[PDB]
Amino acid sequence: MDIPKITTFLMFNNQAEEAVKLYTSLFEDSEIITMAKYGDPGTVQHSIFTLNGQVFMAIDPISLFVTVKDTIEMERLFNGLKDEGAILMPKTNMPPYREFAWVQDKFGVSFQLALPE
Fold first, then answer.
1. Is the dihedral of CA 68, 70, 74, 80 positive or negative?
2. Which residues is the chain interrupted after (C–N above 2.5 Å)?
3. What is the span of the domain harbouring residue 22?
4. For position 90, which CATH number holds?
């Protein structure tokens, strides 16, 4: 269950269980490894799935979800990407993460920065 440093992260309306079901079914070496719904209820809070043995995540724009090594990795990527960027959410201690941030960079790509601890 080892997730890449950078995971493509798909966010849906309330369509994640279907989207996942759809892609999992088409692509070959693929499998739902984790789904957690909300207690909007019945919606996906957290999914980790495979497509050709590659790890994706979905919940509920189509961001990059970065698992950070350190407080210091966080600092660097945060400050690097935040330039002329939007901060969707700033550095925040957010269980189950030591820290988490959400930045759109100047060109428009969303990065989620997640420090596990």
1. negative
2. 39, 60
3. 1-117
4. 3.10.180.10
